[PDB]
Amino acid sequence: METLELQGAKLRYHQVGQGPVLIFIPGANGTGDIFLPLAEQLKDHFTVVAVDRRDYGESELTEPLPDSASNPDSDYRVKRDAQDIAELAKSLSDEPVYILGSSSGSIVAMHVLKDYPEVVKKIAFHEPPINTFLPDSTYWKDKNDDIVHQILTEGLEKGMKTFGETLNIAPIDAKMMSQPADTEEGRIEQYKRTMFWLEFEIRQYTHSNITLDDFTKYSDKITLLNGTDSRGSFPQDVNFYINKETGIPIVDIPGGHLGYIQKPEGFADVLLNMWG
Amino acid sequence: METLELQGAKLRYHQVGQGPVLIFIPGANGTGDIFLPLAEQLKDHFTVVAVDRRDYGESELTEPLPDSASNPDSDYRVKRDAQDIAELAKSLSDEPVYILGSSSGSIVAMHVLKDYPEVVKKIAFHEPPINTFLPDSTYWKDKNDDIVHQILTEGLEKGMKTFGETLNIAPIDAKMMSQPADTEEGRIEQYKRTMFWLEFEIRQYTHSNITLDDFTKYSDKITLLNGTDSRGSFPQDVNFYINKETGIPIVDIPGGHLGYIQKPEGFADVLLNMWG
Ligand SMILES: *C(=O)N(NC(=O)OC)c1ccc(NC(=O)c2cccc(Oc3ccccc3)c2)c(C)c1
Ligand SMILES: *C(=O)N(NC(=O)OC)c1ccc(NC(=O)c2cccc(Oc3ccccc3)c2)c(C)c1
C-alpha cells in the first residue's frame, strides 16, 4: 500500500491503473480493499485510489483522537476525513479528480465538495445515510441515538449482574455498585469506567503473576481481610486458601465488599487494633 | 487533590491526617473518594492517602496505553499500578508505609509487595479476587474469559441486526457485512472496528452539517447512485429526496449496498458511461 503522511495520521491507500485519478472512499468497513475488484475493471481508464480512512485498516493515527470525538455532535472526524481526501488528491494530481464514496464514505465525499470543491472534477454519492437536511431528520437521528445507546449500555448492565451472581456478591454491595452517578458527566464516565475495567483490568489482574511463595517471604507483614456482611462470596474463598497454605491470619471486618464506606467506624477500629 | 507526576501519568490522590502514611488502593471503581469516610475515622493516627489509580477518576494518562494492554495476558497495567504506589510511598515517607487494597486494588497491593517489598511496613489484602495460584484457577479464569467475551460481543451482534432492519438493508448485503474475518487478528479488529464505528462515526456523520445548498452550488459535478438490488433501503430514500430538491440525477447501478464488490463489471461499466 502507498502512504501519505498527514497531520495526525499516516494515510494508507491502494493505487492501480493509469489515467485520471479516481478516489474511492469506503463506508462503514473503513477500508479500501473492498474496491479492488472494481479497480481491476477500471484500471485502463483511471488511476484508481482506494483509501483506508485514517481510523481503519492499515492507516494509523500518530496522535490520539481528541477526547470529545465521542460526542455525537462532534465534527472533527468527518472534516478530517474530507481533508485527508483533498490532500491525497492534491498529492497525486495537478487537476481536479474523480471521487466516489459509499455510505459513510459518501458523507465524507459530501464534505470534500463542501470544503474543498476545487479538488473535485466529478463526484458520486453512492447510498448516503445522512439525515441532517431531510424533512424527517429528527426521526432518523433519534432512531440512531436510541440504537447506539441500546447497544453500548444494555449488554454491560446485564453482564455486571451475571458477574455478581458468579461471584456471589452480597445485595448490599450490588445495590451500591450499580447506583447511577449524580451527573450526566459522571454517568458517561461511569459507563466508560466499567467498559475499560472489563477489557483492560479484570482478566489481566485476576490471572496476574502472584504465587503463594510471594506471600511466604513476607508473611509477617500481611493481614487478610474478609467482610462480615459478604460471607459466601468468591474473594473470601481466595483468602481462605491463602490462609490454608501460609498461615497468614484472616481478620473479619465490618460490612461487605464495600465495608470501608458502609461501616467506616467499625472498619477503622479493626484496622486500629491491627496496626494502631 | 494532590498530584504526583510519574512516567506516563499524573497520579492524583486525597491526603488527610497525621502520623505514619497509610495508602488505600481502590478496587473496580478505581477512585479514592470511596475511602474518605474511613479516612476521617483514621486521620488522628495516620496520614491517610487515597489514590485514584492512573486510568481512573482525576488521574490522567500523559501517554496512550500500549495497544497490547487489551490482551488478557498483558501485565503492564498491574505492574504500573504497583510501581505508582511504590513511588507515591517514597515521595511521602522516608520509612516503609501501611498499605490496604480492596478487590483489584488488593491485587495491586500484592504486586507492590512482590516488586517493592522495601516500601511496605504492613499490608492488608481486603477481599482479593485473584485466581492464579488457586487449585481451581483454570475454572475461575475460564469463567472470567467467558463473561467478558459475552458482554463485549453479543450486544453488538444483535444491534447490527436491529440497525439492518431499521435501514431495510438487503439480505445479500447483510450476509456480507456480518461474515467473520478469516484470522483471529482480523476478528479482533473486526469487533474493534464496529464498536469504534458505533461510538465515533454513525451519529456524527449521519447528522453532520451538509445542506441542500451545498449541493446546488456544484450540481453539475454530482451523480447520486442507487443499487439495483438494494431497493427499499433507507439510503435510497435520501437520494430520492436530494433529487427531488436539486434535480441532480439518480443513476441505478448494479448490486446492493456493496454492489461495487458484488457486481464489479456492471458497477464499472455504469461509471465508465458516466465518466469515461
Ligand atoms: C454504510 O456503510 N452503512 N450505512 C447504511 O445506511 O448502509 C445501508 C452501513 C453499513 C453497514 C452497517 N452494518 C454493519 O453490519 C456494519 C457496521 C459497521 C462496520 C461493518 O463492517 C462492514 C461493512 C460493510 C462491508 C464489510 C464490513 C458492518 C450499517 C448499520 C450501516
Ligand atoms: C472488586 O472491586 N471486584 N471484584 C470482586 O470479586 O468483587 C467482589 C468487583 C467489584 C465490582 C464488580 N461489579 C460491578 O458492578 C462493577 C465493576 C466495575 C466497576 C464498578 O464500579 C464500582 C465498583 C464498586 C463501587 C462503586 C463503583 C462496579 C465486580 C464484578 C467485581
UniProtKB/Swiss-Prot annotation, chains A, B:
Name of a matching Pfam family: Abhydrolase_1
Keywords attached to this entry: Hydrolase
Domain AB hydrolase-1: 20-137
Protein name per Swiss-Prot or TrEMBL: Uncharacterized hydrolase SAUSA300_2518
Top EC class, one word: hydrolase
Annotated region described as Disordered, given as residue ranges: 57-76
Molecular function terms, GO-annotated: hydrolase activity
This enzyme's EC code(s): 3.-.-.-
InterPro entries to which the protein is assigned, alphabetical: AB_hydrolase_1, AB_hydrolase_fold, AB_hydrolase_sf
A cellular component annotation (GO) from this entry: membrane
Top-rank taxon: Bacteria
Entries under PANTHER family matching the protein: HYDROLASE, PUTATIVE (AFU_ORTHOLOGUE AFUA_2G14860)-RELATED (PTHR43798:SF33), MONOACYLGLYCEROL LIPASE (PTHR43798)
Sequence similarity: Belongs to the AB hydrolase superfamily.
